[model samples]
Target chain A: MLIAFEGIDGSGKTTQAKKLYEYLKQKGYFVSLYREPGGTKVGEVLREILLTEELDERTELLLFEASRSKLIEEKIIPDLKRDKVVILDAFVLSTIAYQGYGKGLDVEFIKNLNEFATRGVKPDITLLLDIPVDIALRRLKEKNRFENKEFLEKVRKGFLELAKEEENVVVIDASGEEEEVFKEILRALSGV
Target chain B: MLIAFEGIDGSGKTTQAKKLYEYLKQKGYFVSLYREPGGTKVGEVLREILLTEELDERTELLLFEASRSKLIEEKIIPDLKRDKVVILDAFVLSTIAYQGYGKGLDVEFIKNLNEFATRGVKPDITLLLDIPVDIALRRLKEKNRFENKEFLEKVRKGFLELAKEEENVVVIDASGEEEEVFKEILRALSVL
Candidate 1:
């Protein structure tokens, strides 16, 4: 099963993804955890440029798509073909939030571009970590790249809308601690 | 005016672009010369992977688009708006030759991809330096990446076909001496 973990910056999506991966690994699942805008060798280089905080919204989104395409085509698809459980930290949903809603580009247009970039690959299940807008920013003490209050609020709403529209997306409240959040995510996955 | 120089690998597009830049500079024209898959800083990073031997056709094409977008947005369009004479060594047309025809992908599909990549930046004048397929191969002695005899032949045919369809494209035989070739290119530009 292809699983995706997604949310805005500082929502602890990465932490939860790692928790799931570790849990699955301890349970003897042949699980592989990967991150978007990275995972493959070439993806690392693209990630460096992307997180450098110099590119505009369009270029940033393009870099994300470029890195995702390389990772999916070179690594993800091959791992899936080998019957491994692939868990992605973030995927096309991040594009919809950051580029479509936050940047004010057409959501449908961004989705179409992502469809092309991803080569029609879609996650089977997604866990959206829901966090309060103010609390999420308060937790970010030392922001590096892609951290902004106004944009984060828009992105939060974008994720909510995605969860409502896309059937595979599962929303887990991130206001609680890690153990509680993981339990919530697990309950959501059990339904699937 | 937007100008483009085109040919198969090692057909002296770079050499001719530099020559044109110098000639225009001497004539007191505010001229700028660029090459695609790069032309700006971020674009150069994209260029490295696009031309690497390891990347697949779709990845290469996507990189080409990303680089083209950055180059045009950051450099080409801005210069054009300021009334500078912009000359590109190879532009979107190369995509048609290499990916579309040479790789046997649908020609029209690649054309649309190019148009999308450049955001509709079309050259006012284009000069295609035509040379024998075998001769072009001989000139590109050190095939570091993306160079092979069979691929070069297909690329040559692609350029020929592109020149036939596009009214702005001028095909000049490169079988002659340097001075003769220069004169032919100048004649092509004069018509613009």
Candidate 2:
């Protein structure tokens, strides 16, 4: 099964993704956990370029897609073919929200690019940890380009709109405590 | 005018790109020269990853597209918009030949991806330095992954087929002397 956890920065998606990985492992499921733009060696290098360097909107989008393509080809597909559970911290949804919505690039264009990058590898289930812009911002110590409230609001709306359209995406309110959010994630997985 | 030079490894695209840049500059055109996978700072980083990493075909394709996207966005577009002559060492044609034909990836898919990455920016003129596989190989001191004779043959065919489809592309016989190839390129540009 391929699962993805997506949310804005500091929305606790990373913690939840790791927690889910641990949970599945304890349950004797063969699980592999990966974070986008950092899982593979190429991804890690791309991540540094993405974070430290200044890039225009299209360049940033392409780099993210490049890292994603590498991760899916190198790790995600192989693990899934072996019947292992693969959990990605962020996937196509993040691109839709961050690049499409936040940067105001065409959402359809982003979707098409995602399809090309992943070769139509849609997640069996996607857990979107939803949080208010202010709350999410307050939780983060270091702010990147997307951490601003206005951008985060657009990203939040983007995630909600995506969840409405995709049947496989389950939205979890991440404004609550971490443990509470994790509980909600667990419940959603059980239903999945 | 935006110009691109394309061919397989050791086909003299790089040397010719530089020569053209210098020639155009001496003629008092505001010209900028760039090489693929290493033009902008981001592109240079991507180039390193592309050269050192073991990437699947799709991953490789995406990274190349990513680097191209960055180059177009950061450098090519601005330079062209300023009415300066921009010469790219390699561009969409290389992707079509190397990834699409040589690697047996979907040609139409490669074309679409190129359109997306380049934002429909077609070259005013493209100079394809055509050389036989053995001749091209013998000319090279160093070789990359696509240097094999069989692969170069497919790439050669790919470039030829593309030239037939695109009227702006001019094929130069790179099998002859360097001076002869440069003269052919100059003649092609005069016509353009």
Candidate 3:
């Protein structure tokens, strides 16, 4: 089973991904968690380049997909084959939200890229930690959603759209305290 | 005006691109030449990573497209708008030939990437310098074409297929002397 956590930068995706991994471990389930645009040697370099470089919208999208392609093949598939519950801090929906909807790139082509990179490997459940754009800004004091207020709003909307469109996706109210949100995460995760 | 020179490694794409640049300069036509996946600053880093890293085929294709996307916005489009004749040593057709056909990736999705990266900025004329795979390997003494012999053959065939499929692409017999091949190129460019 694969479960992914996705949302705007400050929506506590990383925190929630960890909480779920811990919850699964406590239940005696074999689980592993990783961050997207990472998880392989090539991905490490790609992640650094993406952070430091000012690149075009299309170029940035491709780089993100490039990192994802390696992660899927090198780690994700093998872990799943061992019957491990795989988790990602982010996944394909992040690309759709940030690059496609926020940056105004082609969502259709982005979807095709997502498919090509994953070889159609999908999240059994995608938990979206939805939050307001302004509230999200409160946390970038620590990251990429430090975009125009309107852009982050668009990205947040993009995540919600996926929650409605995809059968396995559910939205969690992440604007609350960490302990409260963890319970919501646990509540949302039932099958896996 | 934009003219792109394409073909397999030893098909004289670089030599012919330079020759055409010099020929056009002699006629007093404002002309400039550049190599794909290298013209822009972002492209330089992408090119280096591509050379040093053993990446997944899909990752490699995305990185290639990432380079081209920046090149189109940063250089190719502006050069053409200035009424200068722009030349590329290799262009979109190289990706179609190599990653799509030679590497057995999805050609349809590859086409979408080409369009997205270039924003439909096509070459006014695409000159394919056709040559056989063994002939191509004969010059690899100088490099990435050192693949399964059959891979280069598939790549060469892919170029020919594009020559027949696209109206603006013309194949030149590059399995000949440099001066003779230059003449064939000039002969093919009467309209430009």
Candidate 4:
């Protein structure tokens, strides 16, 4: 089973993903954690280009998809063959939110390209850490680059809209404390 | 009009492709000649891994597709859009010959994936230089680093089979003098 977590910057998706990893490990589930664009060795090389450089949205989508392809081809498929639970911090949904919705690339085009990346590998469950833009922005004071308020607002709406689109995505209100948000995440995964 | 030339290792594809390039230039046709797996800057980086390293056949196939994706995305399509006649030394036919026949990957599978690499950009004409295995082996002994005569036999049969399957490929006998082979290529291109 693969579970993916997605949200805007500073929405605590990473924290929650790590917490779930620890929880599953404690439960004796064979779990492996991966993050998009930097999961395997080749993926790490693509990650730097995707995040730190300036590129057109199409190029950005292709780079992110390339990294995802490398991860799936190198790591994810092998783990699946081993019958381990693979938990991804971010995957195709993040591309849809950031590049398709926020950066204004065609959503369907990104979706089609990402289909090639994963070769139709869909997560069993996705947790969307939904938070208001202003609240997420308050938590984003440490970000040096890619930190525009208007863009963040657009990105926040993108995640919310994505949660509506995907049936597997569970929206968790991230306005509360981390523990509370994590409890909701546990509940959602339990249902899955 | 974009044209591609393909054949087994020693079928004199490069010599013919370059000859066509010079002929097109002399004829004042707006033309540019390029080869796959190492066309543009990013493609050159990809080319290093593809050609210099020993890789699994699927890895070879994917790297070829990735490099071609970069080639078309960065160079081929842009040149074609400007109405330049782009001559590709090798393209999907190599995947058909190598991974599909020599490496025993499914022909339909490789053909479909390579179609993705081109993004539906089929060449206007494809000159498939054909020669017998014994003759090709004699030529391969003179060349360096691609001197597998047994594998060349399989690839030669693969090209013949592919020319029968794909519509755009035009088979030409490259066993004669350079002028004769060049004329055959030009005649194939003129048919387009």
Indicate the worst ten consecutive residues by lDDT in candidate 1 chain B. B138-147
Question: Which pairs of residues collide in model 4?
Answer: none
Each model's total of backbone clashes: 0, 0, 0, 0
What fraction of the reference structure's interface contacts does model 1 contain? 0.28
Those runs of model 4 whose alpha carbons end farther than 4 Å from true positions after fitting are A52-63, A96-121, A133-141, A147-167, B52-63, B95-120, B132-138, B144-158, B177-179
Ranking by TM-score: 2, 3, 1, 4
Question: For every candidate structure, what is the RMSD over all alpha carbons to the true structure, in angstroms?
Answer: 2.4, 2.2, 2.1, 3.9
DockQ ranking, best first: 3, 2, 1, 4
**Model 1 over residues B21-136: C-alpha lDDT tens digits?**
89988989899988887888888878877656487666676777778778778888899999899999888778889888787766776776666567788999889988887777
- TM-scores, in order shown? 0.92, 0.94, 0.94, 0.79
lDDT of 2 by residue, B1-192 (tens): 889999888888898888888888998999999999789887887898888878878878888888898888888889999999999999999998999889888988888888878999999899999988888888884654345777789999999999999659988999988788888999999933
Q: Which stretch of 10 consecutive residues in model 2 chain A shows the poorest summed lDDT?
A: A141-150
lDDT of 1: 0.82
Off by over 4 Å in 3: A142-146, B142-145
The better candidate by TM-score, 1 or 3, is 3
Pitting candidate 1 against candidate 4, the one with the higher TM-score is 1
Please, what are the lDDT tens digits per residue for candidate 3 over residues B95-157? 999998899998887887899999998888899999887777877755644656878888888
Model 1 residue A19 distance off true place after TM-score fit, in angstroms: 0.4
